[PDB]
């Protein structure tokens, strides 16, 4: 729900940002239309075309105000002020970004070290694309297919899954894709018994 | 001490319009009591001169339409400086004045008449008065940039990264 | 085509398979490159859909970070859509990529709008979209059709605006 | 008029890019991250170009004097005229820099020159640091 709230907030914020920006184009489109009608026709919105025949903006001349010490020095020192501001928020935003990056990054080094020091080794290991997920996952070939077995029903392929809850490693076979639970070990544990 | 810019400054005089009403005849009379009317302008000097004497495209159209405007030239040609003159009028609600200053350069070698130079823009809309587009554009752009910054920082907060997938939401 | 001698085969008025007259269509390097890239990616998508019928990743191709990455994506596209039997197509695509004035679709649309707002000939418009000229006279000499047809101020404005529109690499 | 014409075309393309990013954000499903980055960078650099070009031609914009058309009727379109006429900032930005100045708060001049010398010293120091190690 917070994601929906923030998405709506950013939508309305960008709409507010663009509403004021539209009026700049609405004003500035008038000059060319006054100078050249045909080029200017398409620039304005249909409502503004209906409002008036466009010849609105015409060139005019006004002199530049006489300069003095009064306003430039204050203008530039206050620009110094806003850019010192921008530097402050620059440092703050960079600090926040680096703190977030450091925390997350050390988290994936924690998982990374768990993976590195949890995996042992000869074994036929490769990457495969999951039928359901479509991503790349590690798989191990453990069947007797290359040892001389003619059993074609099963390929002896087990996918490696890092257990999120226990931070351990588990093997999921290809054939038994129906049992989805933690009781896989006992549900699949079969045996051969000889009675005399 | 915080001052509201005179460009956005808007004066309302309900008593004057109630007493006299809005007309081209007294539009300058309506403007007289406003803060925008400088007391150092030669128009006020002409006003006291008249008072003492009594006690003792569309530019050419409005030129030929009114005789008091004539009297305005024949009383204003003698005095050079900051003066208030009408720009255009469309009845019964729209009037705009022309804010220009005059320097009657009568020096030898200049065949042109007195120099007329603009100073300000004033628009009389209804009973209200209005007085740079560059500032408008930069203000709109900067507010748009602020909103964009807020949206982008929120979106980057929403962003989450994993090494094995990339960035997702 | 100094004197706009396009011949019968390339007349301004074209008769399509529907029998209606159409304006002759001319595309510069950017427009032609974008059109051919769009056609190739659409054909690749159709091929993938057909293969899935008999039996995400495409967003990265159109959006290229750099020229070299764009060229690598182009090579992959040619390998997966053309078969490598057409060297002339590869040479033309490389020439388009290396000397494409504009990479983004919106900027190309801006250039098209700027050039064809005046209503010039499609040949002249495509030539201006292909050639970047510093001065109006340079374009007028290098494009003899533009002589006597466009004012020098307009040509200078168009050339300066186009030079400003060029996306920095 | 040429300067305002260039401002017009560039601002029109900027508004077109804004409309673009708008109608690809309005979808109920968010596209890939990379497309969003490309759109952001393109539109934002375009805004930079807008700012630079508006900077370049301040004199032409200032010289122009605004005046309503004789044919334009104000009696019926006074609301539309007032809409474009108004220029006061949105309030939130106003108190935003008011709090910013509140937080920021011959002495000022000598701090200014001290900032000058710190800037120059830091620039020279990083030039030296870059020159210390061969980066080619």
């Amino acid at each position: 729900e917070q994601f929906v709230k923030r998405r709506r907030d950013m939508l309305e914020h960008i709409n507010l940002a663009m509403n004021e920006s539209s009026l700049a184009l609405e004003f500035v489109s008038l000059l060319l239309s006054s100078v050249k009608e045909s080029t200017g026709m398409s620039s304005m919105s249909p409502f503004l075309r209906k409002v008036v025949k466009p010849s609105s903006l015409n060139s005019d001349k006004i002199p530049y105000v006489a300069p003095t010490k009064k306003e430039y020095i204050e203008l530039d020192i206050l620009n110094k002020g806003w850019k010192l501001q921008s530097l402050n928020e620059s440092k703050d935003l960079l600090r926040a970004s680096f703190n977030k990056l450091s925390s997350i990054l050390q988290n994936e080094h924690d998982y990374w070290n768990k993976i590195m020091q949890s995996i042992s080794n000869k074994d036929v290991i490769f990457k495969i694309r999951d039928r359901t997920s479509g991503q790349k996952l590690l798989a191990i070939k453990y069947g007797y297919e290359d040892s001389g077995s003619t059993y074609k029903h099963d390929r002896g392929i087990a996918n490696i899954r890092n257990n999120i809850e226990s931070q351990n490693l588990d093997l999921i076979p290809h054939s038994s894709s129906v049992f989805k639970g933690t009781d896989f070990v006992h549900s699949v544990k079969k045996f051969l018994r000889v009675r005399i | 001490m915080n001052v509201t810019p005179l460009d956005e400054l808007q004066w309302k005089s309900p008593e004057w319009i109630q007493v006299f009403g809005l007309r081209t005849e007294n539009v300058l009379d309506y403007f007289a009591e406003s803060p925008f009317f400088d007391k150092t302008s030669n128009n006020q000097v002409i006003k006291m001169q008249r008072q003492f004497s009594q006690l003792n495209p569309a530019r050419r159209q409005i030129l030929f339409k009114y005789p008091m405007y004539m009297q305005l030239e024949e009383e204003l040609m003698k005095l050079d400086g900051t003066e208030y003159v009408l720009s255009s009028v469309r009845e019964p609600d729209f009037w705009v004045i022309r804010k220009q200053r005059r320097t009657n350069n009568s020096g030898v070698g200049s065949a042109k008449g007195p120099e007329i130079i603009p100073l300000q823009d004033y628009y009389i809309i209804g009973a209200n008065i209005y007085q740079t587009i560059f500032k408008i554009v930069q203000s709109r752009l900067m507010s748009t940039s602020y909103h964009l910054n807020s949206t982008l920082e929120s979106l980057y907060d929403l962003i989450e990264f994993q090494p094995s997938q990339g960035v997702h939401y | 085509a100094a004197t706009l001698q396009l011949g019968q085969e390339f007349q301004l008025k074209q008769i399509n398979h529907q029998g209606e007259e159409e304006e002759l269509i001319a595309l510069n390097l950017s427009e032609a490159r974008l059109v051919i890239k769009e056609a190739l990616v659409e054909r690749r998508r159709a091929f993938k859909r057909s293969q899935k019928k008999h039996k995400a990743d495409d967003d990265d191709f159109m959006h290229s970070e750099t020229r070299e990455k764009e060229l690598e994506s182009i090579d992959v596209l040619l390998e997966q859509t053309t078969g490598g039997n057409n060297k002339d197509l590869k040479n033309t695509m490389q020439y388009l990529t290396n000397f494409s004035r504009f990479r983004d679709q919106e900027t190309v649309g801006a250039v098209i709008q700027l050039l064809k707002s005046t209503g010039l000939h499609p040949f002249e418009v495509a030539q201006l979209g292909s050639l970047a000229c510093d001065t109006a006279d340079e374009a007028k000499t290098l494009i003899p059709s533009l002589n006597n047809k466009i004012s020098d101020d307009e040509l200078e404005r168009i050339l300066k605006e186009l030079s400003n529109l060029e996306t920095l690499y | 008029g040429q300067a305002l014409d260039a401002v017009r075309m560039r601002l029109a393309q900027l508004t077109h890019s804004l409309r673009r990013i708008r109608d690809e954000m309005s979808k109920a499903e968010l596209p890939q991250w990379y497309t969003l980055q490309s759109q952001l960078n393109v539109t934002l650099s375009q805004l930079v170009s807008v700012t630079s070009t508006l900077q370049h031609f301040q004199e032409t914009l200032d010289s122009t004097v605004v005046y309503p058309l004789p044919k334009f009727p104000t009696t019926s379109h006074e609301s539309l005229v007032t809409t474009l006429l108004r220029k006061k900032n949105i309030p939130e930005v106003d108190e935003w820099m008011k709090y910013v100045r509140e937080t920021s708060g011959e002495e000022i001049e000598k701090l200014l020159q001290q900032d000058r010398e710190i800037t120059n010293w830091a620039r020279t120091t990083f030039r030296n640091e870059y020159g210390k190690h061969d980066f080619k």
Partner: peptide
């Protein structure tokens, strides 16, 4: 020509922020 015109993005609902103060005589 022109690939596409701009959609009308008028905001009459915007309340505006005109400062009013010199009304008293």
């Amino acid at each position: 020509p022109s690939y596409s015109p701009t959609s009308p993005s008028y905001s009459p609902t915007s309340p505006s922020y005109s400062p009013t103060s010199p009304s008293y005589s």
